[PDB]
Amino acid sequence: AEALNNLGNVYRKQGDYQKAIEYYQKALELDPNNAEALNNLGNVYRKQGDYQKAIEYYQKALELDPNNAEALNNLGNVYRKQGDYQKAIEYYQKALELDPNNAEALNNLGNVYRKQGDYQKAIEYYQKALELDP
Protein backbone atom coordinates (compact mmCIF):
# COMPACT_ATOMS: atom_id res chain seq x y z
CA ALA A 1 0.00 0.00 0.00
CA GLU A 2 3.03 2.33 0.26
CA ALA A 3 3.50 2.15 -3.52
CA LEU A 4 -0.26 2.89 -4.10
CA ASN A 5 0.00 5.82 -1.63
CA ASN A 6 3.01 7.20 -3.55
CA LEU A 7 1.19 6.95 -6.90
CA GLY A 8 -1.76 8.87 -5.43
CA ASN A 9 0.61 11.49 -4.02
CA VAL A 10 2.09 12.21 -7.46
CA TYR A 11 -1.26 12.56 -9.25
CA ARG A 12 -2.50 14.64 -6.27
CA LYS A 13 0.56 16.89 -6.54
CA GLN A 14 -0.08 17.41 -10.28
CA GLY A 15 -3.77 18.16 -9.70
CA ASP A 16 -5.19 14.89 -11.14
CA TYR A 17 -7.60 14.50 -8.18
CA GLN A 18 -9.73 11.69 -9.61
CA LYS A 19 -6.66 9.52 -10.35
CA ALA A 20 -5.34 10.27 -6.83
CA ILE A 21 -8.66 9.18 -5.27
CA GLU A 22 -8.34 5.83 -7.16
CA TYR A 23 -4.87 5.06 -5.75
CA TYR A 24 -5.67 6.16 -2.19
CA GLN A 25 -8.81 4.03 -2.21
CA LYS A 26 -6.69 1.05 -3.43
CA ALA A 27 -4.31 1.62 -0.47
CA LEU A 28 -7.35 1.57 1.90
CA GLU A 29 -8.46 -1.78 0.46
CA LEU A 30 -5.09 -3.26 1.57
CA ASP A 31 -4.94 -1.47 4.92
CA PRO A 32 -8.38 -0.06 5.86
CA ASN A 33 -6.79 1.63 8.90
CA ASN A 34 -4.00 3.44 6.93
CA ALA A 35 -3.63 6.90 8.41
CA GLU A 36 -1.71 8.38 5.49
CA ALA A 37 -4.21 7.04 2.93
CA LEU A 38 -7.24 8.28 5.00
CA ASN A 39 -5.73 11.75 5.50
CA ASN A 40 -4.61 12.06 1.90
CA LEU A 41 -8.17 11.11 0.81
CA GLY A 42 -9.73 13.84 2.97
CA ASN A 43 -7.12 16.17 1.44
CA VAL A 44 -8.20 15.40 -2.13
CA TYR A 45 -11.92 15.59 -1.26
CA ARG A 46 -11.33 19.00 0.39
CA LYS A 47 -9.32 20.23 -2.64
CA GLN A 48 -12.18 18.94 -4.91
CA GLY A 49 -14.82 20.71 -2.88
CA ASP A 50 -16.55 17.49 -1.75
CA TYR A 51 -16.88 18.69 1.82
CA GLN A 52 -19.14 15.86 3.03
CA LYS A 53 -16.63 13.22 1.78
CA ALA A 54 -13.70 15.26 3.22
CA ILE A 55 -15.41 15.24 6.66
CA GLU A 56 -16.05 11.46 6.27
CA TYR A 57 -12.35 10.55 5.79
CA TYR A 58 -11.10 13.27 8.21
CA GLN A 59 -13.38 11.94 10.99
CA LYS A 60 -12.20 8.36 10.05
CA ALA A 61 -8.57 9.57 10.48
CA LEU A 62 -9.30 11.20 13.89
CA GLU A 63 -10.77 7.85 15.04
CA LEU A 64 -7.36 6.18 14.57
CA ASP A 65 -5.35 9.19 15.80
CA PRO A 66 -7.07 11.94 17.83
CA ASN A 67 -3.79 13.97 17.90
CA ASN A 68 -3.39 14.80 14.20
CA ALA A 69 -3.20 18.60 14.38
CA GLU A 70 -2.94 18.59 10.53
CA ALA A 71 -6.28 16.69 10.24
CA LEU A 72 -7.89 18.64 13.11
CA ASN A 73 -6.97 21.81 11.20
CA ASN A 74 -8.18 20.52 7.85
CA LEU A 75 -11.49 19.43 9.46
CA GLY A 76 -11.88 23.01 10.74
CA ASN A 77 -11.02 24.30 7.26
CA VAL A 78 -13.67 22.06 5.64
CA TYR A 79 -16.25 23.32 8.17
CA ARG A 80 -15.20 26.95 7.47
CA LYS A 81 -15.52 26.38 3.70
CA GLN A 82 -19.10 25.09 4.28
CA GLY A 83 -19.87 28.20 6.48
CA ASP A 84 -20.25 26.25 9.75
CA TYR A 85 -18.08 28.67 11.71
CA GLN A 86 -19.16 27.24 15.09
CA LYS A 87 -17.84 23.77 14.13
CA ALA A 88 -14.77 25.25 12.42
CA ILE A 89 -13.84 27.15 15.64
CA GLU A 90 -14.46 24.03 17.75
CA TYR A 91 -12.00 22.12 15.56
CA TYR A 92 -9.37 24.92 15.45
CA GLN A 93 -9.66 25.04 19.31
CA LYS A 94 -9.22 21.23 19.47
CA ALA A 95 -5.99 21.66 17.44
CA LEU A 96 -4.83 24.43 19.86
CA GLU A 97 -5.72 22.33 22.94
CA LEU A 98 -3.33 19.67 21.49
CA ASP A 99 -0.72 22.22 20.36
CA PRO A 100 -1.03 25.83 21.59
CA ASN A 101 1.89 26.81 19.30
CA ASN A 102 0.08 25.84 16.06
CA ALA A 103 0.61 28.88 13.81
CA GLU A 104 -1.89 27.63 11.18
CA ALA A 105 -4.59 27.01 13.87
CA LEU A 106 -4.06 30.47 15.43
CA ASN A 107 -4.05 32.08 11.92
CA ASN A 108 -7.17 30.14 10.90
CA LEU A 109 -8.95 31.06 14.17
CA GLY A 110 -8.26 34.74 13.54
CA ASN A 111 -9.59 34.24 9.99
CA VAL A 112 -12.89 32.78 11.15
CA TYR A 113 -13.36 35.55 13.79
CA ARG A 114 -12.62 38.22 11.13
CA LYS A 115 -15.27 36.57 8.81
CA GLN A 116 -17.66 36.54 11.87
CA GLY A 117 -16.98 40.19 12.71
CA ASP A 118 -15.32 39.58 16.12
CA TYR A 119 -12.29 41.73 15.23
CA GLN A 120 -11.19 42.00 18.89
CA LYS A 121 -10.79 38.18 18.99
CA ALA A 122 -9.29 38.15 15.46
CA ILE A 123 -6.48 40.55 16.52
CA GLU A 124 -5.84 38.44 19.64
CA TYR A 125 -5.46 35.21 17.57
CA TYR A 126 -3.40 36.86 14.84
CA GLN A 127 -1.01 38.39 17.44
CA LYS A 128 -0.50 34.93 18.98
CA ALA A 129 0.49 33.66 15.52
CA LEU A 130 3.15 36.33 14.82
CA GLU A 131 4.48 35.92 18.44
CA LEU A 132 5.96 32.60 17.15
CA ASP A 133 8.05 33.28 13.97
CA PRO A 134 9.18 36.50 12.22
Author numbering: 3 to 136
What do the study authors state?
We used X-ray crystallography to determine the structure of a construct composed of 4 repeats of the new variant and a C-terminal solvating helix, CTPRrv4, to 3.0 Å resolution. CTPRrv4 crystallized in the P3121 space group with two molecules per asymmetric unit. As was observed for CTPRa, the C-terminal solvating helix was not resolved due to a higher preference for end-to-end stacking between molecules in neighboring asymmetric units. The resolution was sufficient to determine the change in repeat plane angles using the Cα coordinates: while the twist remained almost unchanged, an increase in the curvature is compensated by a similar decrease in bending. Although these changes may at first appear insignificant in the context of a 4-repeat array, they translate into clear differences in the longer superhelical arrays, leading to a decrease in helix length and increase in helix diameter. Furthermore, when compared to other CTPRs, all of which exhibit backbone RMSDs within 0.72 Å, the CTPRrv backbone differs by 1.4 Å relative to the CTPRa backbone. Circular dichroism spectroscopy of the 5-repeat proteins used in this study shows that the CTPR α-helicity remains intact in the new repeat type. Whereas CTPRa variants unfolded and refolded at a plateau force of ≈12.5 pN, the plateau of CRPRrv was significantly lower at ≈9.5 pN, indicating that the introduced mutations have a destabilizing effect. Importantly, the overall lower stability of the rv-type arrays relative to CTPRa arrays is due to a larger destabilization of the intrinsic energy than the destabilization of the interfacial energy (ΔΔGunit ≈ 3 kBT and ΔΔGnn ≈ 1.7 kBT, respectively). On the contrary, a single CTPRrv repeat is unstable (1.1 ± 0.2 kBT) and requires the energy from the interface with at least one more helix to fold.
